[PDB]
Amino acid sequence: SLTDSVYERLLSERIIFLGSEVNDEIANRLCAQILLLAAEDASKDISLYINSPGGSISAGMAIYDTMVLAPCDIATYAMGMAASMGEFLLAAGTKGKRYALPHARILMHQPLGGVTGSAADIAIQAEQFAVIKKEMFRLNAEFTGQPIERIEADSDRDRWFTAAEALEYGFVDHIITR
Template identity: 35%
Template sequence: MNLRHDPSRWGFPPPNQPPEWQPHLPGGPGLPGWLEERLFDQRIVMLRGQLTNEAATGIAAALLTLDSAGPEPVQLHVASPGGDLSAALSVIDVIDALTAPVHALVTSEAGGAVLAVLAAADRRAAYRHARFKLAEPRAGGVTGTADEVAAAAGQHLRELEEAVLRLAEVTGKPRSRIEDDLSSGRSLSAAEALEYGLIDEVVAPKGR
């Protein structure tokens, strides 16, 4: 297992920077405007808390704006336990369409549908105390007639298959293994996620 110690190679701020560079706690109030602006100037997009369709719209807009501003890598900082699968796939579609590469950094946690977003990034890293939760992505709430509910269930299964294939491709694991781990709700440390293939690197403090 290879724990590399040079976060500057990725263009990520090291984990011992001042707190203003680590606004990655899931949930809670929104970031101050000045901090959002400063992060945006550094080509950093935050994925915090539950990934909803509304949050996905904002993340997609930020990614597209930064992509149009230049070809330099965009940093996607992830601190999310999961969210709606449809929202995750909408972010993935944008990442796939970008010219600029996306470098994802898991700062505290990543789980559920957000793991598929992580898999879509060109590079994936995590701080050494980050945690990962393999859990079956949830579907958004569906109401309507029996036929509408059945159609929505079929759509969710197709979307779930796409997410599983994404994870299988990036990890090199068989599809059946990914499905089993999602069903069992397997949890991984950053080091275990590196070994599993979810990330490419664990960012550790220099000198350790």
């Protein structure tokens, strides 16, 4: 397929894309690609272009863990839009190798979700929310160097960053130029 063929030619250049809603399906393909690339060449960098409005946290943590556990460095490039898990993953890039294209936009906000059943069931879901929320913040604080209190505050509602603002907040290390 043409599209695939292009992505493939790129894949052999150690360039992978995260271009949509992060589902299990998309996550798993990504984790596979990293596993694959790391096995081909443990020394050379992997470049991860991100243009994603975010998605499943669980699915995103698969990618994150996979990134972290990879032998090689993982460079992250924010292009167009890096939101929610998109931002997270971007910010999880190996430190010093996190890039933003100049008109990219970063979006940070607290997790979304749902609440379903009996009151007992809901109690449990809620307990998990607390855990997850705590953890996601802890990480974003770690990535960015901001204090967890600020991450929490800022994440409360949609928090938008221009590339410049993102650089100073600590999501990203560099902005690319020309």
